[PDB]
Amino acid sequence: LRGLSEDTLEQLYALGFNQYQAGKWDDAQKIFQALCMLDHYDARYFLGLGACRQSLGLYEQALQSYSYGALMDINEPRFPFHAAECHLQLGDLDGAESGFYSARALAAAQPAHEALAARAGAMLEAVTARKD
Protein backbone atom coordinates (compact mmCIF):
# COMPACT_ATOMS: atom_id res chain seq x y z
CA LEU A 1 0.00 0.00 0.00
CA ARG A 2 3.10 2.25 -0.01
CA GLY A 3 2.89 5.49 -2.02
CA LEU A 4 -0.77 6.48 -2.26
CA SER A 5 -1.79 9.89 -3.60
CA GLU A 6 -2.90 12.67 -1.22
CA ASP A 7 -6.50 12.10 -2.19
CA THR A 8 -6.54 8.49 -0.99
CA LEU A 9 -4.52 9.37 2.11
CA GLU A 10 -7.09 12.09 2.70
CA GLN A 11 -9.99 9.61 2.35
CA LEU A 12 -8.23 7.02 4.53
CA TYR A 13 -7.91 9.88 7.02
CA ALA A 14 -11.64 10.55 6.73
CA LEU A 15 -12.43 6.86 7.41
CA GLY A 16 -10.30 6.75 10.59
CA PHE A 17 -11.83 10.03 11.74
CA ASN A 18 -15.35 8.67 11.16
CA GLN A 19 -14.66 5.38 12.93
CA TYR A 20 -13.30 7.43 15.86
CA GLN A 21 -16.45 9.61 15.79
CA ALA A 22 -18.45 6.36 15.85
CA GLY A 23 -16.76 5.05 19.00
CA LYS A 24 -15.20 2.24 16.97
CA TRP A 25 -11.79 2.79 18.53
CA ASP A 26 -9.89 -0.36 17.69
CA ASP A 27 -10.78 -0.10 13.98
CA ALA A 28 -9.91 3.64 14.00
CA GLN A 29 -6.58 2.95 15.74
CA LYS A 30 -5.60 0.52 12.99
CA ILE A 31 -6.26 3.04 10.20
CA PHE A 32 -4.37 5.93 11.90
CA GLN A 33 -1.56 3.45 12.60
CA ALA A 34 -1.46 2.74 8.86
CA LEU A 35 -1.60 6.45 8.01
CA CYS A 36 1.31 7.17 10.44
CA MET A 37 3.42 4.61 8.60
CA LEU A 38 2.48 6.06 5.18
CA ASP A 39 3.38 9.67 6.02
CA HIS A 40 5.58 10.13 9.10
CA TYR A 41 5.43 13.95 8.92
CA ASP A 42 1.74 14.71 9.03
CA ALA A 43 0.93 15.53 12.67
CA ARG A 44 -2.82 14.86 12.35
CA TYR A 45 -2.22 11.12 11.90
CA PHE A 46 -0.48 10.99 15.21
CA LEU A 47 -3.21 12.96 16.81
CA GLY A 48 -5.63 10.33 15.60
CA LEU A 49 -3.48 7.44 16.74
CA GLY A 50 -3.12 8.99 20.14
CA ALA A 51 -6.77 9.69 20.43
CA CYS A 52 -7.85 6.13 19.75
CA ARG A 53 -5.38 4.77 22.18
CA GLN A 54 -6.61 7.20 24.80
CA SER A 55 -10.20 6.06 24.39
CA LEU A 56 -9.19 2.48 24.73
CA GLY A 57 -7.36 3.30 27.86
CA LEU A 58 -3.94 2.75 26.38
CA TYR A 59 -2.40 5.81 27.90
CA GLU A 60 1.30 5.18 27.49
CA GLN A 61 0.87 4.27 23.87
CA ALA A 62 -1.19 7.36 23.38
CA LEU A 63 1.67 9.39 24.81
CA GLN A 64 4.18 7.99 22.35
CA SER A 65 1.99 9.13 19.54
CA TYR A 66 1.23 12.59 20.95
CA SER A 67 4.97 13.16 21.65
CA TYR A 68 5.98 12.47 18.09
CA GLY A 69 3.08 14.63 16.92
CA ALA A 70 4.33 17.58 18.96
CA LEU A 71 7.72 17.43 17.25
CA MET A 72 5.92 17.62 13.89
CA ASP A 73 3.86 20.66 14.84
CA ILE A 74 5.50 22.65 17.66
CA ASN A 75 2.53 25.07 17.68
CA GLU A 76 -0.24 22.47 18.17
CA PRO A 77 -1.81 22.59 21.67
CA ARG A 78 -3.90 19.39 21.35
CA PHE A 79 -0.70 17.35 21.78
CA PRO A 80 0.47 18.61 25.17
CA PHE A 81 -3.19 18.90 26.28
CA HIS A 82 -4.24 15.24 25.73
CA ALA A 83 -0.78 14.05 26.65
CA ALA A 84 -1.56 15.74 29.98
CA GLU A 85 -4.90 13.89 30.24
CA CYS A 86 -3.05 10.61 29.75
CA HIS A 87 -0.47 11.64 32.36
CA LEU A 88 -3.32 12.40 34.73
CA GLN A 89 -4.96 8.97 34.26
CA LEU A 90 -1.62 7.44 34.87
CA GLY A 91 -1.02 9.29 38.05
CA ASP A 92 1.71 11.54 36.76
CA LEU A 93 0.92 15.02 37.95
CA ASP A 94 4.18 16.59 36.83
CA GLY A 95 3.73 15.36 33.27
CA ALA A 96 0.15 16.55 33.52
CA GLU A 97 1.12 20.01 34.83
CA SER A 98 3.87 20.34 32.24
CA GLY A 99 1.45 19.44 29.39
CA PHE A 100 -1.47 21.63 30.51
CA TYR A 101 1.08 24.52 30.94
CA SER A 102 2.54 24.10 27.41
CA ALA A 103 -0.94 23.62 25.93
CA ARG A 104 -2.09 26.88 27.54
CA ALA A 105 0.82 28.82 25.99
CA LEU A 106 0.38 27.35 22.49
CA ALA A 107 -3.37 27.73 22.66
CA ALA A 108 -3.21 31.35 24.01
CA ALA A 109 -1.15 32.41 21.01
CA GLN A 110 -3.86 31.19 18.62
CA PRO A 111 -7.44 32.59 18.57
CA ALA A 112 -8.62 29.29 17.00
CA HIS A 113 -7.72 27.57 20.28
CA GLU A 114 -9.43 29.88 22.75
CA ALA A 115 -11.74 27.27 24.34
CA LEU A 116 -8.78 24.90 24.69
CA ALA A 117 -6.67 27.66 26.31
CA ALA A 118 -9.27 27.90 29.10
CA ARG A 119 -9.74 24.12 29.46
CA ALA A 120 -5.92 23.95 29.70
CA GLY A 121 -5.91 26.76 32.29
CA ALA A 122 -8.68 25.05 34.24
CA MET A 123 -6.92 21.66 34.10
CA LEU A 124 -3.60 23.20 35.08
CA GLU A 125 -5.22 24.75 38.15
CA ALA A 126 -6.93 21.48 39.13
CA VAL A 127 -3.58 19.68 38.78
CA THR A 128 -1.78 22.33 40.79
CA ALA A 129 -4.53 22.14 43.47
CA ARG A 130 -4.16 18.34 43.61
CA LYS A 131 -0.38 18.82 44.05
CA ASP A 132 -0.69 21.40 46.88
Next chain:
Amino acid sequence: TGVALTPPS
Protein backbone atom coordinates in the same frame (compact mmCIF):
# COMPACT_ATOMS: atom_id res chain seq x y z
CA THR B 1 -14.67 14.25 26.53
CA GLY B 2 -12.62 12.63 23.77
CA VAL B 3 -10.20 14.36 21.42
CA ALA B 4 -11.46 16.92 18.92
CA LEU B 5 -9.69 15.69 15.79
CA THR B 6 -9.29 17.96 12.77
CA PRO B 7 -12.08 17.27 10.24
CA PRO B 8 -10.98 15.85 6.85
CA SER B 9 -11.05 18.19 3.82
